[PDB]
């Protein structure tokens, strides 16, 4: 199937409490594989998946150097953005950045990403063409002008089309035991009385990977979109994910209800019913 690699970065200033905190993580698909935290005692890029541990010390030294450099540029940028937005040095502010690539089954680039936010709002993003920018406001237009002058987009495109794809391919092969295995959901339907006249039907999906999943309730073949409580897909803590969908049903009409489960680890989409 298709796959992705992403790096996420967050810098958060804390006036009066030292330099900004910097945290960056790397993922392949829904699997965390590297992290760096500026507040660690001896901050280094660290492995978080077994298949990356085999990379040699040259790899780890270089990835550490890149993270530390990003921490520094972010510190500088937080100061710059105070100027761009006419803000005081008193408050905490946040810079976020994500970049990476999606590849298809054949391993070719499907799409590249590089986008930034300040204080939780879009700041500047590389467009899908990997050659132009979208700036959210007049401050971000200053950055856009700088990055156009430094030919940032051309270098980013080179990375996204080159190393990003190539190393994603490398990781997928080295980690094929896990990265290329889908774990289907373990499913069940539970019944929870509310009152005389109604009860909750809850459809469970447990232990699945990757996170992408569709859980829907139907009443006599009709989608109960408006009346379904759907919790956010949540991590179990052991690579896998969990989710549930619930409907409130008039007691007696339970059999008019079926839960449907779609997951890439499922050959046929599943159909579940409540059973006492």
């Amino acid at each position: 199937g298709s796959h992705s690699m992403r790096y996420f970065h967050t810098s958060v200033s804390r006036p009066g409490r030292g330099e900004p905190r910097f945290i960056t993580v790397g993922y392949v698909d829904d699997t965390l594989f590297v992290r760096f935290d500026s507040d660690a005692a001896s901050p280094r890029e660290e492995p978080r998946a077994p298949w990356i541990e085999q990379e040699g010390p040259e790899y780890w030294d270089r990835e550490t150097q890149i993270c530390k450099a990003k921490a520094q540029t972010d510190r500088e940028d937080l100061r710059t953005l105070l100027r761009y937005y006419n803000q005081s040095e008193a408050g905490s502010h946040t810079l976020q950045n994500m970049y990476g690539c999606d590849v298809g089954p054949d391993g070719r680039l499907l799409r590249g990403y590089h986008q930034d936010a300040y204080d939780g709002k879009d700041y500047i993003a590389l467009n899908e063409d990997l050659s132009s920018w979208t700036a959210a406001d007049t401050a971000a237009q200053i950055t856009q002008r700088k990055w156009e002058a430094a030919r940032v987009a051309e270098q980013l495109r080179a990375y996204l089309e080159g190393e990003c794809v190539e190393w994603l391919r490398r990781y997928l092969e080295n980690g094929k035991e896990t990265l290329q295995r889908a774990d289907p959901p373990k499913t069940h339907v539970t019944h929870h009385p509310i009152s005389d006249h109604e009860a909750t039907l809850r459809c469970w999906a447990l232990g699945f990977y990757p996170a992408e999943i569709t859980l829907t309730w139907q009443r006599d073949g009709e989608d109960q979109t408006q009346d379904t409580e759907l919790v956010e897909t949540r991590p179990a803590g052991d690579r896998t994910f969990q989710k549930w969908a619930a409907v409130v049903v008039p007691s007696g009409e339970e059999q008019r209800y079926t839960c449907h489960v779609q997951h890439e680890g499922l050959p046929k989409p599943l159909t579940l019913r409540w059973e006492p």
Binding site: F8, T10, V12, M98, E232, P235, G237
Partner: protein, 99 residues
């Protein structure tokens, strides 16, 4: 802008009294990233609680998983207590083994 955290409290595996498990509190959809999260046993703060490294979703909002090993019982009550700038007082969500 400020975004208030969503909170889910749940176990890694189906809960069976007397069997070792993990208690999870997943906090998400929040901004800014500063947040206080505690796991409680019978109203009291659990000491050894670990958490994931800060990351974020497509809409830029943050998420974290806080977790600890636990062995649930019939009597023991567990909860997650969350404090954030968007909250006038800390929000407590009790563990319901059916959610």
């Amino acid at each position: 802008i400020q975004r208030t955290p969503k909170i889910q409290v749940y176990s890694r595996h189906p809960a069976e009294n007397g069997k070792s498990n993990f208690l999870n509190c997943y906090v998400s959809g929040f901004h800014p990233s500063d947040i206080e999260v505690d796991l409680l046993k019978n109203g009291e703060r659990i000491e050894k609680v670990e958490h994931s490294d800060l990351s974020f979703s497509k809409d830029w909002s943050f998420y974290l998983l806080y977790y600890t090993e636990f062995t649930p019982t019939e009597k023991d009550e567990y909860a997650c207590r969350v404090n954030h700038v968007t909250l006038s007082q800390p929000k407590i969500v009790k563990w319901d083994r059916d959610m």
